[PDB]
Every structure is written in structure tokens, then in C-alpha cells.
Amino acid sequence: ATLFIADLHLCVAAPAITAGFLRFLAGEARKADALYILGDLFEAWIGDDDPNPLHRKMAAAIKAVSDSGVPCYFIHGNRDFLLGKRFARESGMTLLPEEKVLELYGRRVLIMHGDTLCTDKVHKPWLQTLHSALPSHVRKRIAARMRANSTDVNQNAVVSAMEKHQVQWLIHGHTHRPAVHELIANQQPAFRVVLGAWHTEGSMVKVTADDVELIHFPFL
Ligand SMILES: [Cl-]
Ligand SMILES: [Mn+2]
Ligand SMILES: [Mn+2]
Numbered sequence: 001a002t003l004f005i006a007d008l009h010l011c012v013a014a015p016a017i018t019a020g021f022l023r024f025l026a027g028e029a030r031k032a033d034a035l036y037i038l039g040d041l042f043e044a045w046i047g048d049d050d051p052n053p054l055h056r057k058m059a060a061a062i063k064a065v066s067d068s069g070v071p072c073y074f075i076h077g078n079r080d081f082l083l084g085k086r087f088a089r090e091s092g093m094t095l096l097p098e099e100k101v102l103e104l105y106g107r108r109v110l111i112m113h114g115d116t117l118c119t120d121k122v123h124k125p126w127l128q129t130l131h132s133a134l135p136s137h138v139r140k141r142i143a144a145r146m147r148a149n150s151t152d153v154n155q156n157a158v159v160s161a162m163e164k165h166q167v168q169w170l171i172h173g174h175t176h177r178p179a180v181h182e183l184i185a186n187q188q189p190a191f192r193v194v195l196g197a198w199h200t201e202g203s204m205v206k207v208t209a210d211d212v213e214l215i216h217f218p219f220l
Helices: 015-026 053-067 085-091 125-131 136-150 155-164
Strands: 002-005 034-037 072-074 093-095 100-104 107-111 169-172 179-185 188-194 202-207 212-217
Touching: 015 053, 015 202, 053 072, 053 085, 085 093, 155 169, 155 179, 155 188, 188 212
Parallel strands: 002 034, 034 072, 072 093, 107 169, 169 188
Antiparallel strands: 002 202, 100 107, 179 188, 202 212
16 A cells, blocks of 8 residues: 655644654554655754754654655655755655656556645756756745745646646645545546645545545544
8 A cells, every 4th residue: 555645744832743643654654565745744844954853753753664665755845845855865755856646556646745736948958957946846835935925726737737747646735625526637537635734633545456545543
């Protein structure tokens, strides 16, 4: 089984969530084929080496999952888009681009945080370099945050991303509204599975060869 979670918004002031995440990593995650964390794992992020005991503890708990044989992957959210390679190495996670297609048990599945779907130069390299100065997953987040500091997902964006990636399944979070949506893409049926935030209960998408399901579980 391949597991997907997001929107934990971990912080020192919310230790029950952190405890529930540790239980998850030490139990369910150990039995998975892989674990995908689709952004907003932390409420905020600046420096990979910030003095934060919470960061050290989470990195070691995640690294203990991957060390046990369960690969771990991370797609940045709008809260933790500065999380970098150093922390990925500390935690044993692979960082993924803002949109990624997986081949899960014969099916193509698009994963992303979901904020780039909203829910509120190229020809010349020397010129292109200037635009790609920061990784795309940082450039778009920084621009949106700056605009929002100065002053539901868009359906056209959903379709457009599923036709661009030739995909009938999409998993994301960000909106904090867990649900399963049906739609049309690529002249076929398509589905968009939305994760929930961990403010009061955990949630995951569990994908197997036979089933996908959106599951909620208490922190215990
Ligand atoms: Cl934000
Ligand atoms: Mn979130
Ligand atoms: Mn978000």
C-alpha cells in the first residue's frame, strides 16, 4: 500500500498532532510500500538548520521509516516551501517537484499540494535562467505570498493539470476539505482525492492494487 498525507501543520504549540504523527510513522507507515507527504508538513519553514527540537525529532522519526525500507517523498506546500535538500537528507526524504506523476499498480496518478490549483522567457536559456533563478516550487510560492501580503480549487485548473499529465487520478491537499470528486479528463472519467488537515484527526489516502480510499483516524 502507498500512503499519502498532508497538511499536518506541525508546530511546538500543538503537541497532540505531533504525537499522532509519531504514532502514524511508527505504526501504519512501517507497513506501507511508500509514504508521500504532499506539503504543509510544518506550519512554517525558514532554515533547514534552524534550532528547533521539533524539527530534529520529526526528521529522525521520518528517517526511521525510510531506514526501515519504506521510501519517503515530499512535495512542498505553501507553508514549508523553503524546506531544502539538507533537511530532506536529515529526514531521509526525497524531494519531488510541485507536480509529479506516479505509476501506482499500473495506474498513473498526479500528486501535488494543491495550492497551485488556487483554492484561495523560455526560448533563451540565458534569459530562462534568470526566470528559473529559484526552483519553480519556490518562485511561485514566494510571488503569491508577497502579493497576498501587499494586496475552493479552480475546476479549469484541475482539468488542465490532468490533461497536461495524461492522468485520470489526482491527489492533493491544501484546501483542508477531505472529499472525493469525479470529473472528465482525456476523454475518460477522472477523480480528484482531497486530503484533510490534522487539526483534530489524522487522514490519509491509502492506494493498493485493488482500492483507493480516503481514511480518517484519531490521534489516540
Ligand atoms: Cl501561506
Ligand atoms: Mn495546509
Ligand atoms: Mn497549503
